[PDB]
Subunit: 727 residues, 4 copies
């Protein structure tokens, strides 16, 4: 009709902008100049809208899209309304099956580049030259919940990367912990059914705090290692940008000479490792169930591109049996103290999708999608995965032509004798649909294996043994890796692990299950077991108190790379601070605060008791982003309260609770001038305390001190003090 | 191995128990004596489990359900492992498309009976005799969120009842407010697209607090009435047991003489009308996203059967 | 590799060639320069093959496409063989549901152009200017059989045309007879279930000669008119090029002023009308079940493009009730004597598809796909079709995005707010997926109806009546159209109709059904009824002999336009002649024969008792196309036997049978010189018979006689003589 | 899976076993069987681990593959004995 505002404020600027400054938008409209080969190849299917007539799917222009055709304006609708029937028919068939696992996920486009050629250890084309850029599409996810479940649940997270290489698609389908819960793919349906909502009533949705999960765990000790990681703060990441990524399985690299090297894949977050605390994560599933999806999208729109370093743990074929654990066991990690991660390249995610359903929901990743230069191993969990992803995409994506859905298409050539199937897009002109043929001179043709652009050939691994359904005896050790993880955590990380087990088992209705889990914990570490038991009102027996701890892993009694926080890796860029306004803010404090945050790439959100604007002491009009209740402290990393007419918000329950919540969740808080009146809300002593910044104004070192606290992420020393606090 | 506790505490007692007293269970095991014609008719497809051997879907007993078949215990998995492939194939194909709208819902079985014969206004068989009972199956739901979204969001709620009558299935597919947002079905895709997660990023999930919804509302004043109900405490019911139900449309009742009477259908909650407050409702989507589903199930397990007039 | 022959004889020349001269091939390879806007728009999905490496669908080059991966060369196949699994998975999912009806069909691309602007009667853009060329895709089909059934069965034929216009796709979905079997769409499932294979045993496949069809017919007299057409030679066309096409229903044309004109659509074959005879057609289902598909394909490859004239029967709105039948009744035809067909344009089919499955199998036609300038009527059969085609395509083509399958895509712009669905190709960038919207300034926008490029608005027909499930009393007349059809046929056409009913009813096992059908025929015409009755061993009763014939149609006692042959319209171009060779052929005969055929565009097939070649009297080496048994007389239009060493073939059983079969099927036979020794096998008098060309040599007079016979298609005067030929 | 519309094609009447069939598989398009087991996984304690595995034996035992000896490298090669 012409319904947009004449000022053009319905449309976001096509330039990098901070979270909340403009409405978010499709990637190609928000950043039209951010391109890569894959993004450019999708131009054939992108559809615009501006200045076009509204039509049916057959191209017929529609005159009235407000009404059905009827016999009289109050009469019955007629069967001959083909416009109504096409529109409703398409609507009626919009949904497709969600993924069986990892249904909840958020994705973005980006690119990868190796630091140097890895030709000496692999012939993979995408790793052969530092100037070779490979477009990527990455999807992060949770495991259990449906597509409509919440983001900040306690769960393992998926980290899947599709590399569009010149020699084929390579999908690296990993998680955010270095091991999996189970050893053999044959138990995947059992484990997944145990973690998912219980079958009679379909509860609970995205959390593992229920009887069937802990029943399975208690009866299958192989799960304890990954359960330890999920109960730690690893299970509640602050953002997809601040978690690690792992392929889990041992794969192989194959070089041009035919030599195989064992490899485990790693992704290191260049923004550092950071997680939430349980109460904050659980409350955030209610205040904003889309927090991680939102944060990823807004980081990219702001220019705070998620960056990750690809790394390899490499083990020579002759060292296969030199560890206490089997390299093919996916419940075991390879300590970085024994085998370092070698840096390989960098991945930058710099553009959001245009349409979530077309690009994210329909993307199909599969660990079997490898390229020459890579190969599999006999890890029995990996072996079963190779069957499952192909199979599940036939029904999820409606047929065998899912590789023709635009996001899944290779950017390199694909030619073969496969034909037909539902939704066939490619129109083959080859006279032949078989080989060998003479009628097309046998094209397309097979290609011998070689150093570059050669055909795929499997590494000739020797196989020897009888046909058996048997777990290798080398996989039968379940407590030493869990113990190594436990001993590598800081004291506050250990407390959070204890609290995770304690909360989860408290939701298990059958008390004997809680007792059996405590007994398993007694096989890992007596301190851990006793602290969980205490929280459950359970007493360890004398036998449990005397269980001898499992052996160290290859002489290691700790590995600091397993901790999130033992070695500081803080990065403040992309973080956000809430600024609690009053109706006569001291403009000088605000100028100093906002420019200091801007200089470090830290975002700010100006909050108040209502929307609109407030006027500072000098007449500056300040736009309000959200109310105190509308953008709770759960969504920010720190809180700053500038001076001004503090009496305006001093008795506001929401403003005081904002600080109590932030205080409880260990976030840095800074109070300027009369905002120090809020110290009584959080019980801060006159002399102050570490973790609370306070001064007469926001000048001098006030912002440097607050930013130092932000770099350390949370104020772990406040734990004992938050214990009380009614919040 | 891995077996039940000696004391039998793994299994819920098959008698009415208050919420949290026992682990919840499948209806036919929790209340085996509760029957109706429809519940009995489902006996042909009910499948037990106790004392039976684990098998493939073709009826072959399985000896080892813990391991794939491999060439040596540290070897590659073999293509001939049909037990593994059947089990994983079925798992791989478990999901079906969720409902386009009202994907989040909770249901139960029950029965209906009229207070007196209504043959003077309708010849419908299920309303003809006070002592002729009709089995029902009811599903309550939200509108916008997916099947894995939260229960206590601010939304219209669906209230759908399937009556298994002697003259055919009658479905009364209503909501918890007496009007709908739009006037003509041709606009349904537009309204639903506007309230659902925005197309670029698929946010937000089960709440209408976002630009596209309010853009549509502001441009289509016919939506204001149902928007008023949604913004009131009607949009955040305490329980599915404590909300009203409406068919919304005017339908017709036809008697034996051929006379038509216009009718609008209502459900009155015999537990009364009650709603949460916003802050409570929003925090509860995080503390227990399955609150309404749980509360309905536990009320029926306790004998606090949802009753509607 | 190099499996192709070094002489390059594996590839067909990319130039027009006669049937059997070269191997057939994909359309874009056979005629690369035949183009139209639709064919050009399909170039984005056309996939080549020459000089490309064989890959997986993910782009990974394959080294060995001959073997599975196994542990040892006689060992078990490994689950990690992802190349094998992808290839077998695609193969396992190649098939999609066939069409519910008209599953057996053959299609080609072409173009349409009007003869003049029709803007005075319609605002349809494709009919607005003679220089407007509209690409078309046409599919011809049978009704009953599956996709693998035979072509030359006795059945109604489908004739569906997709017009890719500038204002949207218009699908004219018609049949080869001017009426349908039933009046209301509610009965379609009943009629179709009655004609299809019976449910217990799924017999018979593509013929209606079974109990359930004739049971339904006998109980539903409205079916008799279309049954009359199916039992005539109209039910066994010689080729899709030699049959008429009809839209059947009365539709409306709408002009720029808003005036509606009733219209019935017609397709007139420019190659003329021609049909087989029953014995030939039935035997042809066994010798070549793909005869019509092959003939269409080879005519296009030879440059014998199928050409049809589009024609309109136009009736003013005020003449709605001027006939003695209802214009909305689809079991009633509009006699051309009463309302002439106005010749409006010409369609030419000039290119075969590249891939049958991608283009033909996946094509989706729907009669509800109309454009501004056209509109529906209340015909109750057409009304229910409007619902059916949209619904069936959801499952047949896997979802609501079937319009994105290449062959179905409009060539004109399409933009709307519809999103998602299985196999969504288009990536929408519109910020909005609803209207009205302000966020994209309400685009795409509605367009008011207008003279050109306007939105679709329904003609505002007045509707008055109660909601009823009732047949109009005006449709309650079943015998006058069947009678008009019968009386318009030639005597031999009438004989063929009698024989059609007689053969079919003889295969009905329950005798009472045959009797009930004969009773219905007595309500149409006594002569027809008696002749069928006599063949069934039935005696008409006293009462049946006195049934008063139905009234004439608006004063007509016949209309020659309903006859295939009453009015001469034969065309020999594209027809084919069998030439029976001997080991020492009189080369002078062959030269004269071939030169004369070539001048008329008639093809030849040189046949012998073995493959290879023979040598003529003068030394000319003649290449044999097929054997006598290999290419039976059923596949040709006439037979010529040149002189030479007849002793070589005079005792050949197959040679003699070839002439007996052609003689029985009323085909022109020409015998030169000593080839006149074959007159004894078909018992022709010494003085000759009309239909048999004979002479001392194959001169110009001999060839003109034969081509004159060919122009009349068959020798109808020979019917009384074939009774005594054991063939 | 595609021909018969999902993973429950064994529930189509002609395909159904006449002997008992019990396991932890659930859901899928056109699911007929309504499982009452409290558990949909094994090992479980909540249904005392039923339905349970059955050792191989002379009659009514679980399926166990014959322990054939496998030896060789992982190859895509036709055995020379087949040529
Ligand atoms: C090391 C252990 C595993 C890891 C790290 C892993 C990781 C993942 C990830 C990240 C996804 C989501 C990909 C996306 O974003 O679309 C996924 C999906 C999936 N996983 Fe795995 N997974 C593991 C084990 C397994 C096993 C053992 C099976 C079955 C044998 C399995 C079956 C599936 C299926 C069927 C899907 C859905 C794929 C689709 O619908 O496209 N996973 N997994
Ligand atoms: C008075 C207005 C309406 C009411 C009260 C209503 C109510 C409902 C309810 C309660 C459900 C869920 C039933 C269940 O629990 O499975 C539902 C589902 C659905 N509704 Fe309606 N609705 C209304 C308007 C519409 C309109 C106008 C359309 C489209 C023209 C529509 C299309 C659908 C569809 C497609 C489903 C999914 C059903 C399925 O997948 O089985 N609804 N509706
Ligand atoms: C005048 C009467 C009719 C004519 C001339 C006609 C003609 C045709 C033709 C030519 C086709 C095949 C199109 C192609 O080649 O793909 C077809 C298919 C079909 N017809 Fe009709 N038909 C008629 C009546 C009906 C009726 C009354 C119905 C149901 C109410 C119906 C339902 C169908 C369906 C479901 C298909 C398959 C479409 C697809 O799978 O794409 N037909 N018809």
């Amino acid at each position: 009709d012409s319904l947009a505002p004449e000022d053009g404020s319905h449309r976001p600027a096509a330039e990098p902008t901070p979270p909340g400054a403009q409405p978010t938008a499709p990637g190609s409209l928000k950043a039209p100049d951010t391109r890569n080969e894959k993004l450019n190849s999708l131009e054939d299917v992108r559809k615009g809208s501006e200045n076009y007539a509204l039509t049916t799917n057959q191209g017929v222009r529609i005159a009235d899209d407000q009404n059905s055709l009827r016999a009289g304006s109050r009469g019955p609708t007629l069967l001959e309304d083909f416009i109504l029937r096409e529109k409703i028919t398409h609507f009626d068939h919009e949904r497709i099956p969600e993924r069986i696992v990892h249904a909840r996920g958020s994705a973005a486009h980006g690119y990868f580049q190796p630091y140097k050629s890895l030709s000496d250890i692999t012939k993979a084309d995408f790793l052969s030259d530092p100037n070779k850029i490979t477009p990527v599409f990455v999807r992060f996810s949770t495991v259990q919940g449906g597509a409509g479940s919440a983001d900040t649940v306690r769960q393992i997270r998926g980290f899947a990367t599709k590399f569009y290489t010149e020699e084929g698609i390579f999908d690296l389908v990993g998680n955010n912990t270095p091991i999996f819960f189970i050893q053999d793919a044959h138990k995947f349906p059992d484990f997944v059914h145990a973690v998912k909502p219980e079958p009679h009533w379909a509860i609970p949705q995205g959390q593992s705090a229920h009887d069937t999960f802990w029943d399975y765990v208690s009866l299958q000790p192989e799960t304890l290692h990954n359960v330890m990681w999920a109960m730690s703060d690893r299970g509640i990441p602050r953002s997809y940008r601040t978690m690690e990524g792992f392929g889990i399985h041992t794969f192989r690299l194959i070089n041009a000479e035919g030599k195989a090297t064992f490899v485990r894949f790693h992704w290191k977050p260049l923004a550092g490792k950071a997680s939430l605390v349980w109460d904050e994560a659980q409350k955030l599933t209610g205040r904003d169930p889309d927090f991680h999806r939102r944060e990823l999208w807004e980081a990219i729109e702001a220019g705070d591109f998620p960056e990750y370093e690809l790394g390899f743990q490499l083990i020579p074929e002759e060292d296969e049996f030199k560890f206490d654990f089997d390299l093919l066991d996916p419940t075991k990690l390879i300590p970085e103290e024994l085998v370092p991660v070698q840096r390989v390249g960098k991945m930058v995610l710099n553009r959001n999708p245009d349409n979530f359903f077309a690009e994210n929901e329909q993307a199909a990743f599969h660990p079997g999608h490898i390229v020459p230069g890579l190969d599999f191993t006999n890890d029995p969990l990996l072996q079963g995965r190779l069957f499952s992803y192909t199979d599940t995409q036939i029904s999820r994506l409606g047929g065998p032509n899912f590789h023709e859905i635009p996001i899944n298409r290779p950017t390199c050539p694909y030619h073969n004798f496969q034909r037909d199937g539902m939704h066939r897009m490619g129109i083959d002109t080859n006279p032949a649909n078989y080989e060998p043929n003479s009628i097309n001179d046998n094209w397309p043709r097979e290609t011998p294996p070689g150093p570059k652009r050669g055909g795929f050939e499997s590494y000739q691994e020797r196989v020897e043994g009888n046909k058996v359904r048997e777990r290798s005896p080398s996989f039968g050790e379940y407590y030493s890796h869990p113990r190594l993880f436990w001993l590598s955590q800081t004291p506050f990380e250990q407390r959070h692990i204890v609290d995770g087990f304690s909360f989860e088992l408290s939701k298990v209705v059958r008390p004997y299950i809680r007792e059996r889990v405590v007994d398993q914990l007694a096989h890992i570490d007596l301190t851990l077991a006793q602290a969980v038991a205490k929280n459950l009102g359970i007493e360890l027996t004398d036998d449990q108190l005397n269980i001898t701890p499992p052996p160290d892993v290859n002489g290691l009694k700790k590995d600091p790379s397993l901790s999130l926080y033992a070695i500081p890796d803080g990065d403040v860029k992309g973080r956000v601070v809430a600024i609690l306004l009053n109706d006569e803010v001291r403009s000088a404090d605000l100028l100093a605060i906002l420019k200091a945050l801007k200089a470090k790439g830290v975002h700010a959100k100006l909050l108040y008791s209502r929307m609109g604007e407030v006027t500072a002491d000098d007449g500056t009009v300040l736009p309000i982003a959200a109310t105190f209740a509308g953008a709770p402290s759960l969504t920010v990393d720190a809180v700053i309260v500038p001076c001004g007419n503090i009496a305006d918000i001093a008795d506001n329950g929401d403003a005081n609770y904002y600080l109590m919540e932030a205080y409880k969740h260990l976030k840095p808080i800074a109070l300027a001038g009369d905002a120090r009146k809020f110290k009584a809300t959080i019980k801060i002593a006159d002399q102050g305390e570490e973790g609370i910044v306070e001064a007469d104004s926001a000048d001098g070192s006030f912002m440097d001190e607050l930013l130092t606290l932000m770099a350390a992420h949370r104020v772990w020393s406040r734990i004992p003090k938050i214990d009380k606090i009614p919040a």
